[PDB]
Amino acid sequence: SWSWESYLEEQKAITAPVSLFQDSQAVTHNKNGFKLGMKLEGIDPQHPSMYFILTVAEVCGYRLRLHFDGYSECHDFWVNANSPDIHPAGWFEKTGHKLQPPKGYKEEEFSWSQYLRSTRAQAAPKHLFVSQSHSPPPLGFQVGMKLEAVDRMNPSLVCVASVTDVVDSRFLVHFDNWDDTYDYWCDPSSPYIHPVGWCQKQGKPLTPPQDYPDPDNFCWEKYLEETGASAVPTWAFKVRPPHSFLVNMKLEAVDRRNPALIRVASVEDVEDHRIKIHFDGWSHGYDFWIDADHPDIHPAGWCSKTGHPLQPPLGGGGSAPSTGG
Numbered sequence: 001s002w003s004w005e006s007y008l009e010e011q012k013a014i015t016a017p018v019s020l021f022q023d024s025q026a027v028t029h030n031k032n033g034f035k036l037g038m039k040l041e042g043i044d045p046q047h048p049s050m051y052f053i054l055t056v057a058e059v060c061g062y063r064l065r066l067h068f069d070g071y072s073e074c075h076d077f078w079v080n081a082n083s084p085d086i087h088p089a090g091w092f093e094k095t096g097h098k099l100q101p102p103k104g105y106k107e108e109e110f111s112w113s114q115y116l117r118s119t120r121a122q123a124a125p126k127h128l129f130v131s132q133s134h135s136p137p138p139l140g141f142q143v144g145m146k147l148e149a150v151d152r153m154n155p156s157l158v159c160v161a162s163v164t165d166v167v168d169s170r171f172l173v174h175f176d177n178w179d180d181t182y183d184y185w186c187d188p189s190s191p192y193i194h195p196v197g198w199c200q201k202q203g204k205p206l207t208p209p210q211d212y213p214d215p216d217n218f219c220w221e222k223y224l225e226e227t228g229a230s231a232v233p234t235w236a237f238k239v240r241p242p243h244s245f246l247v248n249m250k251l252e253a254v255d256r257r258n259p260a261l262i263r264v265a266s267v268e269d270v271e272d273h274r275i276k277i278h279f280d281g282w283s284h285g286y287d288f289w290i291d292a293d294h295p296d297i298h299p300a301g302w303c304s305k306t307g308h309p310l311q312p313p314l315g316g317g318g319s320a321p322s323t324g325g
C-alpha cells in the first residue's frame with residue numbers, strides 16, 4: 001500500500017500546502033452524483049464558445065469522462081464534478097444559448113424530451129451540478145466591453161479583445177474579428193487579461209483586430225469610437241498575486257498523455273502564474289507547464305479522499321524504459 005506519509009519520509013520531501021491551491025482544486029468532501037449514461041450540456045474545451053450534448057461515459061472518484069453524442073470517442077474528455085463548464089439539460093434554452101446538436105441532427109431538430117426517448121436515457125439531475133447560471137456576475141465586466149488579452153494559442157501575442165458573454169461568475173474573452181476557436185473563459189483575476197492601454201504603457205506590441213485597416217496605426221480611442229464600445233473599467237481588474245508553489249514541493253496531477261490517470265508529481269520549475277510538473281520516477285521528457293489554478297492539479301491526498309486511483313512513482317530508476325527522474 002502506497003501512502004504520502006511514507007513517501008515523504010523516504011524522499012525527505014514536503015508537499016505543496018493546501019493553502020496554495022484554489023478551494024475548487026482542493027475540495028474533497030463533495031459527492032460525485034454523476035452516473036454512466038447521464039446526458040447533459042457542456043462547452044467543447046477546444047471551442048469554448050460552443051455547446052454540445054454530452055453523455056457521461058465513465059466515472060472515477062470526483063471525475064467523469066464526457067462523450068460528444070454522435071461523434072468519435074477520440075474527442076472524449078475528463079472533467080471534475082465541480083466543473084463550471086457543464087450544465088444540466090435545458091440550460092441553453094433557459095439562458096438563450098445556442099446548441100450544436102448531436103451528429104446527424106439539425107438544430108431545429110432537437111428537443112430534449114424527444115432525444116431522451118430516442119436514446120432511452122435520462123438527463124443528469126439539476127442538483128448534481130454547479131453552474132446553471134443563477135450566480136453573481138463578475139463585477140464590471142459586461143458583454144460588449146473591450147480589453148486587451150493574451151492569445152493562449154499564441155502566448156507572445158496580447159490582442160484587442162471583447163467580452164462576448166457572461167455566465168454566472170465568469171465571462172468569455174473573444175479576439176476581435178478572429179474566429180471564436182480562440183475564445184476562453186475568464187474571471188476578473190485572470191493574469192491573461194488587461195485593461196485597454198496596458199500594452200502601450202508596457203511597451204509591448206498590441207495585436208489589432210484581424211485585417212484592421214492600416215494595423216500599424218491602430219488607436220484604441222478611434223476604435224472605441226467606431227464601435228461605440230466601452231473599455232472594461234480599470235477597477236474591474238483584480239490581479240491575482242503570483243502563486244507560491246516552490247520547486248520540489250509534491251502534489252497530484254492528471255496525466256496529460258493518458259487523462260484517465262493521476263500521478264504523484266513534483267514542482268520542477270516555476271513562473272509567476274504557472275508551474276512545471278514532473279512525474280516522480282519518470283524521465284523529464286514528459287514534464288509540462290500548467291496554470292497554477294488549473295482544475296487538474298491537486299494537493300497530496302486528493303485522490304485517496306475522493307476515491308480516485310493514484311499512480312505511484314514509476315519504478316526502475318533509470319534501468320527501466322522512460323525512467324531516470
Ligand SMILES: CN(C)CCCC[C@H](N)C(=O)O
Pocket residue numbers: 151154157159175178182207
Ligand atoms: C491573434 N490571435 C487571436 C489569432 C492568431 C491567428 C494566427 C493564424 N495563423 C491566422 O493568421 O489565422
